[PDB]
Design a protein around this ligand. Sequence first.
Ligand SMILES: [Zn+2]
Ligand SMILES: [Zn+2]
Ligand SMILES: [Zn+2]
Ligand SMILES: [Zn+2]
Lengths: 328, 336, 342, 335
Amino acid sequence: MVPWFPRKVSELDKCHHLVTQVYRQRRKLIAEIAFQYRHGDPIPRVEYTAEEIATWKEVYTTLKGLYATHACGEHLEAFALLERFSGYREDNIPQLEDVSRFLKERTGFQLRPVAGLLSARDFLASLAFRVFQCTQYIRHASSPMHSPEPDCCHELLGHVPMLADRTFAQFSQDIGLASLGASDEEIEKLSTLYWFTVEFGLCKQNGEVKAYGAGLLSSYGELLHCLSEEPEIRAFDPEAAAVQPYQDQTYQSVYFVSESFSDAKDKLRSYASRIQRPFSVKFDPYTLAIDVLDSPQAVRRSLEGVQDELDTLAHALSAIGAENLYFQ
Amino acid sequence: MVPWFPRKVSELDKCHHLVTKFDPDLDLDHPGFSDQVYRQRRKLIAEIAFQYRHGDPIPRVEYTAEEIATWKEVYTTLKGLYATHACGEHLEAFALLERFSGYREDNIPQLEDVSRFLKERTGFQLRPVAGLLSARDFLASLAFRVFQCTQYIRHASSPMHSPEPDCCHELLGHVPMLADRTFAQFSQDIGLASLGASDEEIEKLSTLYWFTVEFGLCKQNGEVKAYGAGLLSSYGELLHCLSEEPEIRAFDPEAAAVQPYQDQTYQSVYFVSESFSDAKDKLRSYASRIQRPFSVKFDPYTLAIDVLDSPQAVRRSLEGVQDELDTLAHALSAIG
Amino acid sequence: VPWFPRKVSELDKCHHLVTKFDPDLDLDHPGFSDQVYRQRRKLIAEIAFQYRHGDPIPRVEYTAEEIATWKEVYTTLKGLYATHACGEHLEAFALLERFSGYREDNIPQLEDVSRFLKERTGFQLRPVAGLLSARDFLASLAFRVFQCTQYIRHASSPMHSPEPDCCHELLGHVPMLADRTFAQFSQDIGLASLGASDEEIEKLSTLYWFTVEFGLCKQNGEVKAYGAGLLSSYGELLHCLSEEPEIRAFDPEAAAVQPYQDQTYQSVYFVSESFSDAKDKLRSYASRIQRPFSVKFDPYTLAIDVLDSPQAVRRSLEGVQDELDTLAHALSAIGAENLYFQ
Amino acid sequence: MVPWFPRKVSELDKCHHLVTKFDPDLDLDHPGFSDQVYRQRRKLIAEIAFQYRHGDPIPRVEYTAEEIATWKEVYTTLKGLYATHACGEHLEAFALLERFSGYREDNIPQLEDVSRFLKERTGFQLRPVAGLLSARDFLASLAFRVFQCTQYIRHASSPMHSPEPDCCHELLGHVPMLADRTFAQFSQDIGLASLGASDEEIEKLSTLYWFTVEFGLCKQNGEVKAYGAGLLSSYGELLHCLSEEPEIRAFDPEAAAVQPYQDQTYQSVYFVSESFSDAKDKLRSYASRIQRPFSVKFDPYTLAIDVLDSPQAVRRSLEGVQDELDTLAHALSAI
Ligand SMILES: [Zn+2]
Ligand SMILES: [Zn+2]
Ligand SMILES: [Zn+2]
Ligand SMILES: [Zn+2]
C-alpha cells in the first residue's frame, strides 16, 4: 500500500474525489460544468440570476466595510486590483476564467472548476501545481451571511486575493508539495495546518494583528470575532497548529498568528522536512510537473537549473552600470 | 533609447510584424500564383492567425484531401531518410508525436494538440502566425518559449520543395527538436539574448539561429547527424548535408553569427556541435559579450521577463534561487 | 566610515586597551599592593606587545603560585560543568584535556590551544596585554582571531577576577569556540562591527555581553550556560541556573539596549532556542545596521571583502558558483555502494 | 579499497615520498657528483626539510656567496627575457615579490617570506621539501593549497641549465603564478582531482600538470605568452617556446593528459589556453569524468578535505553555500 500522486498538471483530471427543486436543478447544472472540465480547457462562464447577484451583493458589501480595519495589507492590495481588472463589484459575480487569468499573470496560480468539497489529498495535491479548485455555485439566498459549504462567494472574496501575493502563493504551494505521497495521518496534520493558516490564520502587520485566513475574510461574524478580545491567540508553530483540535459549526476559539508570511513559510519548510517520506519533490514551473528527488542524480539534475540561474545573475551584475537607462 | 521588447507573454500580440518574401500575390513564380482556390485558402488561414490573441485556444483547420495528400508525400519521403540522417533527439520526439500528437501519413496534426505536447515536455507553446515574422519579433517570442507557427500548406504542385515555412516545415522540422529540454533551452537562450538588442546584434543572432536551429549538425557517437529544421524538413538538403560535397566546420558562435548565407540553393557550409549541452555553453559565452546595459531573466511561473537592471532587481531573482536551494537541501536529508 | 582592518595582519593596529581594572590603576585589585605580581604582569604584557601576526605564540614559564591559582579555579569549576555547562562546552573541554594540556597541575600554553582551535573551527589566538576596547576586540573576531591574555589572577582571590585572566579565556571562552556554529556566531558579531558607528559598537558590545559572555541556551527543554563569564566563575555559574535571576528569551534588539553592571552577578540573562536560531536572529539584527556596504570574509587569505558595488558582489558570487560545481560533481559521483577507504 | 589520502593539512607530514632522479650520489653525470663540498651542502639542506613538521616555522637557510652568485646569473638573465616572453600575471607578481619578498639579484629569498606573501594573496603556503616528491604526494599537497618547495641551489658549474628543481626553479618559475587567484584555483583543482584516484589517473593528471603548470602557454591580447614554471625558470626554453620551432596546440585536458613527453631537450609540443578562467572550466569538465565514487571539497577555515561521498555529506557543505548567498543577498539590498 503506497499512495499515488500526480506528477503532471494534466493528471489533476484524476484528482476529483469529492467528500460526499429549482435551486437543486441549478446546482446540478453548474456541477456538470465542473465534471465536463479537462485541464487546458477555458473555464466556462455562468450567467448568474438576479437572486444570485443579490446574494453576492449582500456578502460583498458587508465584508468590504470590515476589510479596511480587519484585513491584512496583501488582501486589501489584491482586492483593489481585482475591483480594477477582474470585475469585482457589488452588482456582478466575477467569472473564474477572468480571475484565473489574473492569478496566472501575478503568481502563476490558476483555477479549476470543482463540483464540490474535494478530499484533503486531492485538494492539497492540486495546490502542489499552483491550481486552486474553485466552486462556481452560489449559496442560498435565504442564509447569505452564513454558508457551511465553500460556495463561489467564499472562494473569490476569501481565497483568491491572498493567492495574488508571491510569498502566500509559495506558502500555499509548499503545503501542497509536502502532501504528495504522504500518509493519511500526515494529510490530516497538513489539512489541520491549512485550517489554522490558509483558512483561519492571523498575521502581525506593523505591531497590529490582521486576518489573512479565507474562512475569516469570507465571514462577517468570524472576521469581527477573530480580532476581538474573546478568542485565544497563539504564536504560529506548525507542529502546534497541525495537532490542534477544531470544529466547523461555531466561531474558532483559538487562532494562530505568524510574524510574517516569509517566516511562516520558513517554519513550514522545517515542519515539512521532518515528514516521513523516502524522497522529496520539486516543482517544474516550465512543464507544471513534479520532479521526484529520490536519488543524488535527481538532485544534481535540478541543481543544474539553479546553477544556470546563478550564471544569469552573475552576468546581470557585470552588465549593470552607473548610467540611468531609457527603455522605449 | 533601448528598443521596446515584450515583458509579458500577452505582449507577443504586439510582435506580429511579417517578412514579405515568395508571396502568392506579388511573386508570379510562386506555384500557387495562378491558383485562385489556393490563394483564397491562403487568405482564409492567414485571417485565423490575425484574429488570434494570447489566451485563445489555437483554432482547428479542417484540411482538404489535396492538402492531406501533399502532407503524405513530404511525411513519407522524409521519414525514410530520418533513421540514417536524423539526430537521436529528433527520432525520439518524432516517435512520441506519432503516438500522442496525431503525426501520421493520412493526417495533418493540429497546433493545439502539438502545443499541449510541447508544454508538458519542455514548456514550449505554439501561436498561429500568418507567415514569416521579422527577426526581432520571432526571437522575442522564443524568449517566452513561444513558437510562432503557420497552419497553411505548400501548393500541391511542388511538394518536395517549398521556400516558405508551411505547416510541413514547422511540424516536421522545428517541433520534434523543441521536445528536447537542452535544445528548448538553447532556443530560449537565443531569444533572451535578443530582447532590446541593436539591429546589428539581431542580424548576428538571426545568422547564429540559421546555422544552429535551421541548418545545424551535431556529433552523435562519433557520427555526424542533422538537427536543423531546414534539413529535417527538406529531402534534398538532408541528403546533401551528410554527403562529402559541403564544408563542415566546428561550432563557434562568433564564426556562425558572421558567416554569409543564401536561401535559394543548398547550404555550402554547415556548423557541427560536440553536443547540445556544449553548444548552449558556447552560446552563453557569446551572449555574455553582447552590448546590453542590463540582463533579463524569465519567470516561468507568470511567463514574464524580469529586467535585471539594478542590484535590487538581482536580489529579487536571487531570493527564488535561495528557496530552490532550500528545497534541494531538504531533498538530500530525505534521501539520507 | 571609521577605519577597520581588511587583512588579518592589520590586527597589529587593533591593540587599544581598557585599563580601569589593571593591578596598577585599580585600588580595589587584589594585586595592587603586590610589587612581585605587578612586575610579573609587566613582563607577560611585554610578550603581547612584541607580538606581530604570523609569529608563534611565545611560551610562559608559570610560577608555583600561578599553577596553584589555576588548580583552585580549574578543580572547583570542573565539578560544576557536568550539571550546569552546555553540551558544546563539555565536548570541547574533554578534547582540550586530552590534546591541549588541560589538567589541574598545568596551565595550558596559547600556542597549543591556537593549533587545537585552528584544526577545529579555524579560530586562532593572539596574545593580548589586557582588555581591548569593544571595537578592536570585535574587529579581531571578524577574522576568527581571539585576543587572549596569558597572565593569571592574583593568588589571594582565585574564585573571583573582574579582569579576563588566562583562567577566564581558557576555561570560559576557548571551549565554546571549538563549535562550528558558535565560532560562526562570534565571527558574525565581529563582521557586523566593521566600520560601524560608536553607538552601534556599544549596542554590539552589550549584545556580546548577553550572549558570548553571559548567554544561556535551551538544550533538550533544559537551560544550560554557554557564556564565558558564567563558565569561568563558580559563583555566577550557580546563580544563573538558580531561581534568583530574570531569564528572558533571546532577542538581539532587546539584549543590545539592556543595561548592565560588572560588580555583582547579572540580574537578567537571555536564553536562545539554539545557536543556529541565535545566529539567524543576529543575521536579521545585523541586516538593519546603518552601513552603506556589506562585508564578506575570505577564509583563504583571512581578509575582509567589502561588498560595496555589483562588481564586488559578482566576484564573491564566482566563488559560490565554483562551490556549487564541486557539489554537482559529488552528486553525480555518489553511488549506492558502501565505500572502503584505506 | 580507496587509496589513503590526507584529509587534514597536518597529514601532509605523511606525504613525503621522494623520487630518485638525477641524484648527486647515484648519477655520475650530475655536475656536483665529483664535488664533495656540494654533496655535503646538499645533505645539510635536505636535513632541514626532513626535520620539518606542519606547524613549525619554515627554516631559514644562510646561503653562501657562491650560491648567491649562481642565483644572480639565473635571476638577471631570465628577468631580461620576462618583459617580452612572460604572461601578465607573472610580471605583476614578480614586481610585487621584488618589493615585498626580497627578490633581488644579490639575495636568495627565504621561503618564510614567500609563504607569507602567497598566503595574503591567494591562500597558498609553502613547506620545505628535500627534493622532488612522487606525483601522488605532490598533487595531494596542492589540494591543501600547499606548495612543496626545495631550498637547495644548482651546482655553480651549470647555472643556465638544471634538470632538478632547485630554489631558482621554484621561486622564479612556480611562485609568481601562485599569486594569481585563478591560477591558484587551477593548481588546487588538479590536486583535488587526484585525491584517492587510481595510479592511472595520477599519471594522467601528472601529464596534464606538465603541459599546463610546467610548460603551458596562454593567449594574452592576441599574443602568445609563457606561464609554465619550466619555461619561466629556463632562459633556453623561454626563447624556444615563443619561436617558430615548436608545435603549439589548443588546450584540451584529455589531449594534454595522454600526450607523451621527455625531460632532456626542450618540449616539441606546447598547449595554449584562451584564458586561465577557460582552462579551469575545461579542467572541471575533465575532472567530472574521473572514475572516483565520491568528490572532495576543501574547507579553507580548518585547511581540511571534506569527502562528499553521501547525500548528507553534500547537504552539510550546501549549508555553507546557502549562508554565503544570504550574505550576498543582503549586500545587494545595502547598495
Ligand atoms: Zn476555504
Ligand atoms: Zn524554419
Ligand atoms: Zn570575556
Ligand atoms: Zn616544476
